[PDB]
Symmetry: C2
Subunit: 386 residues, 2 copies
């Protein structure tokens, strides 16, 4: 029914992902987090229906779009809230910057769990806030929080804001309810505001269940907000819409005020349309996708185990992204990436972008047809040094 | 012609700002917010269909083709030559204004506007905790003019750091002469002011009036000035969300781009990119046609008001599709003027007082609609005006 077998040709679309391939046709990309899968058919139709409006002027977020978000959140994540708790933002990374600027002052400390999505550290640093990197443990193939050190990091730096990634990118760690509750209790104790980046929430796999942060405790809304989107779930990043759910009146007003100060309050018409459409029609597409992602991940894990046993592979609990550790090889980061790029002809995300814990790591995107994922894994193991 | 300026597409199901009230009260005729009730040029519609047919709607970048289109537009239309590297895309011009305020001034510092002017000018200054300096425009012989003596006083007395210029000026539709802009630039050089020229209406000058892009006035002006513009007002594509800054000075360009990234306001949607390139590539004949329709609508309005409401003082635009109306000769308050227009005449105009104190007892009228709609709106405006 849905096509997860053939990858639409993207070379002519000015994509980030395929940019290098436009000049060097032998490069295969598997880095930036979008998919080489056709998007659900109803979004395509919604774009055609937009063209047929004939006039492309100024629009606002409808009651139907607000209801679609409420309905998705309740039905998928058991998170019940009011339409007025929703704030639309053209992207989640924009929302992170707005939250930093609203909820902290210059020089105050913002904590992250490293290694993590590079715009977290970037946005803190560029905003002239103190970055506190709470280093994740790695135990038995999974990231885990050191709660003793996390508390030390909060107290020793007077942390004002915690940027949480859940599911955590990279690694694809789907935090248990009990882990989130311990995090929230630290924030309550130490008077920390928390932003939960839950953009990957719909992509938990292998029986792992997303727990949205404010569902953990009814008091968590007093200090925490949730960011999510339809874009990673449904491969519609180019449509530019996302949302913050901010139930606390003071937090909500502060975020919205800062958004307006920055004139960052407006969203494109297709931004609105694609999100409403994706949530209304996307459940069966997403079910079918998850089966394909699980198969690609299982394939990659087994292939790597057989062809490059020295390569340490973190199996995701969610997301379509695999965190690869080349630390057992006699390499530098520069030699690793020259090797992958110039010899293997594959483009992966550089692990050192995610923090010092990502040195000698790469991140591999498996959201593409299995035939492409097979080729990418073959390239990755081809030229690894003895 | 080949192009439809005769029939207004039905926008009631599109969640537009402009027609929102009419969806509940179908008697209401809107003529306020600046988008048009004309079909967009066909090549844009086709390009949206072509985007759907990409099939995957992932992350995209601004192409060399888009960069070249913007360069070619500026050169061809406005005699403004610069490098592809001088272009900065921003999802809107109002976004760019806030980025510029944050980049080029610090909290507490003074930003100057010519009042009355586009309300987001004053809003963006105030909400950013900068000092607003409102240099009040003169009105002489039916046109806004700058009082240069007072403009200099306002800069000096307030240590003005940044001047937000509107050119063409909204409201009123004043298409500033090269010589006016020369004098403004000289003041900025003298007093060390950075100038942001909002030229979003630049393609919509009319009746022989020609837009003069700020940095074309003198080759040194880009040392302190930058230009904001867009395809969106010109081509009625505001919902596609793209615009640009032209920033030739390396320091100013880096400062703007840095603030933009600090704010994570550096990304633009795929249709943002596509619709702008398309409009600039194919839009010239459509714009020639639009401008004839706009001139005929404005001429109609001026003449109709002269006959039916000679007490109504009408500023004839030199550009833009917006007319500034002065009801000052009527025995009215602002609140009573707008209840009269909205509740009794069933027409929605922009409230003049939104633009500054100088706009008290004024309203702004949007005539970018088919002539028949414009005729009705004008009829309603004069229907209910008090003795
Ligand atoms: C991809 C990603 C984002 C991207 O957000 P935009 O909405 O495209 O700005 C945000 N957070 C994480 C953790 C991501 O992986
Ligand atoms: C309409 C208008 C804008 C609107 O800009 P966006 O690009 O839609 O943010 C900006 N400046 C002036 C003077 C306008 O009239």
């Amino acid at each position: 029914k849905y096509n997860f077998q053939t990858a639409p040709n993207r070379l002519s679309h000015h994509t980030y992902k395929w940019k290098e391939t436009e000049t060097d046709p032998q490069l295969l990309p598997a880095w930036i987090a979008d998919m080489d899968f056709e998007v659900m058919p109803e979004v395509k139709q919604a774009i055609h229906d937009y063209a047929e409006q004939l006039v492309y002027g100024y629009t606002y977020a409808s009651d139907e779009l607000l209801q679609a978000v409420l309905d998705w959140e309740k039905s998928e994540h058991q998170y019940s809230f009011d339409k007025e708790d929703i704030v639309f933002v053209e992207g989640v990374v924009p929302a992170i910057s707005i939250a930093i600027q609203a909820f902290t002052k210059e020089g105050e400390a913002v904590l992250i769990n490293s290694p993590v999505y590079p715009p977290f550290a970037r946005s803190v640093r560029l905003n002239n806030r103190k970055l506190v990197s709470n280093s994740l443990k790695e135990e038995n193939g999974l990231f885990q929080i050191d709660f003793e050190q996390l508390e030390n990091d909060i107290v020793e730096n007077d942390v004002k804001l915690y940027l949480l990634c859940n599911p955590h990118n990279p690694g694809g760690r789907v935090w248990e309810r009990e882990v989130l509750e311990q995090i929230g209790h630290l924030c309550q104790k130490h008077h920390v505001i928390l932003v939960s980046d839950e953009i990957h929430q719909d992509l938990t796999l292998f029986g792992h269940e997303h727990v949205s942060f404010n569902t953990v405790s009814p008091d968590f809304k007093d200090f925490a907000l949730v960011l999510s989107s339809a874009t990673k779930t449904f491969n519609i990043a180019g449509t530019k819409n996302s949302y913050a759910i901010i139930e606390n009146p003071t937090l909500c007003a502060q975020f919205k005020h800062q958004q307006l100060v920055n004139n960052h309050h407006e969203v494109s018409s297709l931004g609105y349309i694609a999100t409403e459409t994706a949530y209304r029609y996307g459940k069966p597409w997403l079910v079918a996708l998850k089966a394909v992602l699980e198969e690609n991940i299982q394939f990659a894990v087994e292939y790597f185990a057989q062809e490059a046993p020295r390569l340490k592979v973190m199996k995701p609990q969610g997301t379509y992204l695999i965190w690869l550790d080349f630390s057992d090889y006699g390499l530098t980061d520069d030699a690793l990436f020259t090797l992958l790029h110039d010899q293997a002809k594959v483009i992966l995300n550089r692990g050192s972008d995610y923090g010092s814990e990502g040195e000698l790591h790469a991140r591999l995107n498996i959201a593409a047809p299995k035939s492409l994922v097979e080729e990418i894994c073959k390239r990755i193991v081809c030229c690894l040094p003895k």
